[PDB]
Amino acid sequence: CPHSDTLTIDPMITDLAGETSRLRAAGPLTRIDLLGVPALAVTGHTLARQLLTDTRLVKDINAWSLWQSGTVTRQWPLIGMIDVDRSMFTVDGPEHRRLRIKTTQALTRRRLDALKPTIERYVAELLDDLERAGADGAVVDLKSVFAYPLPMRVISALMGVPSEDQEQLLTWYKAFFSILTPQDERLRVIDEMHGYFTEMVRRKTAEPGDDLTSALIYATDGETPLTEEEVIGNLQALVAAGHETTVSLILTAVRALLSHPEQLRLVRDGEIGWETAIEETLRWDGPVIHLLMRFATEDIDLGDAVIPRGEGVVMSYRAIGRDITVHGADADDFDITRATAARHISFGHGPHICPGAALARLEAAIALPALFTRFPHLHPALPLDQIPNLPVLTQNDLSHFPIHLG
Ligand code: HEM
Ligand SMILES: C[C@@]12CCC[C@H]1[C@@H]1CC[C@H]3CC(=O)CC[C@]3(C)[C@H]1CC2
Ligand SMILES: [Cl-]
């Protein structure tokens, strides 16, 4: 492969390890190309922390030079990750906190202890599915039977999505994220998803229930109520984020522990906490690869570099998790005993830091020990090295996870 000053992100994810290494080497700020569209990539831990609190980088797409000039339009296959309805995801400044508060309040750890019985029930239900699927030593897809449905069940219970609509949502998201989806079909799926969530908020407005979507609609606290667009916007972000990332976290942790048996023993024998094994997974093999996208409202001088006004800036969180300056020379290794396991920023940093990190950590802390307690000899039916990524450029999405129960 020839040398180039712009690092093209392969949409097929054929060499993720090599790409992540090249990003780190060319960092901590590099030029990248996203399906023919240029941007900058932040690949250093320290510089990411600084820029994630810099008020001169905004989420609003109208600040993008290439959106203003009309050179990037809705035909860009990744536009559904950026040009979205108004929500906590797209707002900065004082307006942002108003759109986050009820969600952060609902997602505090102690508030989540009321949801913990539900998580435990779904984990138990889907392990029963695993037991039936894996009878007579048959090969079982851990993703389809267990890891893929569980987070959609949990987030649906929190937000109020009916049990009978979840398979359709999953089908829509798979099309939304896959780069093979024809662009005209992807934009219609986005419109169909918007339509569903719009009617869901109108149904919850007329008949509220014990869920967060009703709390966003009502529960004013004395401040200006959220607009219909804002409620729908937060609902869409929460379901999309709450499902996509957690499926990856569950699967990557199982793969990391099954490929490092000595470390799986440490958490099963109670010498290292399962929570620590989860943090090292987030640092080393976390759900987000690249986070689109931030835009400079003015020129940002970084000493020996300048982010021009209007430039798009991506947070390459996977490369950031392999930061050798922060984690040492063995940063590319999975090691749940490392002293910097919980110092990652895989949930982000600054105002837009993930509001559901406590829920993500709770789902994994329940599912993982329950899986290995139920199936103590679970092992891969396919070499773990050969499980491919789905063609989703921005997310760490595994295709299928063939196992034997043992
Ligand atoms: C499972 C592991 C998860 C990871 C690794 C993760 C990662 C992230 C990151 C890195 C961001 C912000 C990116 C940035 O602004 O630079 C974010 C935002 C967000 N996440 Fe999480 N997430 C996870 C789980 C969840 C869950 C369970 C939920 C919902 C309960 C959730 C809901 C959200 C929302 C609504 C935002 C947007 C917040 C804002 O922009 O102010 N995520 N997530
Ligand atoms: C990048 C993530 C993982 C962490 C945050 C997620 C996005 C939140 C906003 C919503 C907003 C949407 O209606 C589309 C999906 C989107 C961009 C999420 C995609 C997946
Ligand atoms: Cl060069």
List the helices and strands and how they pair.
Layout: E1 7-8, H1 16-26, E2 29-34, E3 37-42, H2 45-51, E4 57-58, H3 65-68, H4 94-106, H5 109-112, H6 116-133, E5 140-141, H7 142-147, H8 149-159, H9 166-177, H10 183-206, H11 212-217, H12 228-259, H13 261-268, H14 274-285, E6 291-296, E7 300-301, E8 306-307, E9 312-315, H15 317-321, H16 324-327, H17 357-374, E10 379-380, E11 402-404
Parallel strand pairs: 1-2, 3-9
Antiparallel strand pairs: 2-3, 4-6, 5-11, 6-9, 7-8, 10-11
Bound molecules: protoporphyrin IX containing FE, ligand NQ8 and chloride ion.
Keywords: Heme, Iron, Metal-binding, Monooxygenase, Oxidoreductase
Pfam family, one: p450
Organism: Nocardia farcinica (strain IFM 10152)
Number of helices, counting only DSSP H or I runs of 4 residues or more:
17
Helical content, roughly? 40-55%
Residues in β-strands, percent = 5-15%
Number of strands: 11
Largest sheet: 6 strands, mixed
Helix and strand sequence: EHEEHEHHHHEHHHHHHHHEEEEHHHEE
Cα separation of the termini = 43 Å
Structural class given helices, strands, pairing?
alpha+beta
Q: Work out the radius of gyration.
A: 21 Å
**Inertia-based shape:** globular
PDB class: oxidoreductase
Keywords: Cytochrome P450, steroid hydroxylating monooxygenase, steroid binding, oxidoreductase-substrate complex, oxidoreductase
Assembly: monomeric
Entry title: Crystal structure of CYP154C5 from Nocardia farcinica in complex with 5alpha-Androstan-3-one
